[PDB]
């Protein structure tokens, strides 16, 4: 016998004139996994099956279960429940997002912005591709460490106040870091023109180094450092 309380953000689009409210659930942690998702599925399975969330891997990769737990954007399948019974876990959907239902946000814009930077290898002549493996030294490859691991959970971009006030025109850390990923990839021949896409007030320059992105990343990555590294390239690249 060991009960923990969960306050969860709830909204039904199918119910007439229902507006957002918090609903509390109680869980015996002895009959539960260590993580928040374990509890989320537990209440979904045993208490209230009206609870709606995204999940898949229960492993910390896919990036489905991205949500605001106790004030910080992380992954429910990676974050363990605070065993402190006296405290009450507050579960919210990712900040400043259009809520489809309960904890399920509309990530369409986020995805679309990722499409706008062209996250694929680009050569000046792709007339020889699919027959030889491109050469990249161990050092040229280590530049991608800390960048490629990104899982597109959108925890960081949703922690950035710049992405709240200007989500429409500002690409956000997640997307920006991936643009940086393809910038320093030695195999990519489009390094200059990729930087040229950011030549406007909003796309990149809405970053003010608030560092909520790097602080919240459930994968331990450093998106802000990459943004600052972009800014330096933006200021130094010739022609």
């Amino acid at each position: 016998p060991r009960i923990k309380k969960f306050a969860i953000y709830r909204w039904d689009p199918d119910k007439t004139g229902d507006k957002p409210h918090m609903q509390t659930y109680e869980i015996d942690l002895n009959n539960c996994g260590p993580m928040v998702l374990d509890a989320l599925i537990k209440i979904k399975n045993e208490i209230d099956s009206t609870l709606t969330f995204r999940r898949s891997c229960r492993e910390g990769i896919c990036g489905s279960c991205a949500m605001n737990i106790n004030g910080g954007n992380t992954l429910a399948c990676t974050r363990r429940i605070d065993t402190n019974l006296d405290k009450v876990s507050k579960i919210y959907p990712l900040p400043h997002m259009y809520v489809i239902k309960d904890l399920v946000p509309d990530l369409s814009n986020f995805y679309a912005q990722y499409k706008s930077i062209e996250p694929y290898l680009k050569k000046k002549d792709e007339s020889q591709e699919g027959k030889q493996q491109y050469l990249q030294s161990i050092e040229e490859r280590e530049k991608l460490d800390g960048l490629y691991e990104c899982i597109l959970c959108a925890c960081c971009s949703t922690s950035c106040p710049s992405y709240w006030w200007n989500g429409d025109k500002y690409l956000g850390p997640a997307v920006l870091m991936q643009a940086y990923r393809w910038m320093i990839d030695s195999r990519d021949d489009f390094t200059e023109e990729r930087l040229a896409k950011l030549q406007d007030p909003f796309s990149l320059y809405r970053c003010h180094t608030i560092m909520n992105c790097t602080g919240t990343c459930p994968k331990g990555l450093n998106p802000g450092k990459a943004i600052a590294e972009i800014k330096k390239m933006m200021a130094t690249y010739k022609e």
Partner: protein, 138 residues
């Protein structure tokens, strides 16, 4: 569908709907590096409001600066109250200056980890207090 066409549909779908925005400032857990950022904007705005008031009053108010200080002297110049006025003027200026250096070190690429942000953040706070107290008495 192109990326631009998708974003156009995203906004047309949501603005014309009854979907509510998830809370942001209301719910987000406040941290030192975060709190220190808004303060940089606050101090930036306050200082520009200071410079602009000081410049426009040189154009809109009669009499020279020397005579304007006699008005300050006229209302009894309290010993503690004059130090507080100097502290409250230097406090936002010194915060913004020291944090500006921290912002300029960042733009060079240096010191961009969460442990470093806490360390360098604290060092600004300590430098602000000392230089604010130090200058207010000269």
């Amino acid at each position: 569908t192109t990326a631009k066409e998708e974003m156009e549909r995203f906004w047309n779908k949501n603005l014309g709907s009854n979907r509510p925005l998830s809370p942001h400032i209301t719910i987000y857990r406040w941290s030192l590096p975060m709190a220190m950022s808004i303060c940089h904007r606050g101090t930036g705005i306050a200082l520009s409001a200071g410079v602009s008031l000081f410049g426009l009053s040189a154009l809109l108010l009669p009499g020279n600066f020397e005579s304007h200080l006699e008005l300050v002297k006229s209302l009894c110049l309290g010993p503690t109250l004059i130090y507080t006025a100097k502290f409250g003027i230097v406090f936002p200026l010194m915060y913004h200056t020291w944090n500006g250096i921290r912002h300029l070190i960042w733009d060079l690429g240096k010191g961009l980890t969460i442990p470093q942000l806490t360390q360098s953040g604290v060092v600004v706070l300590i430098l602000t207090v000392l230089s604010s107290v130090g200058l207010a008495a000269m």
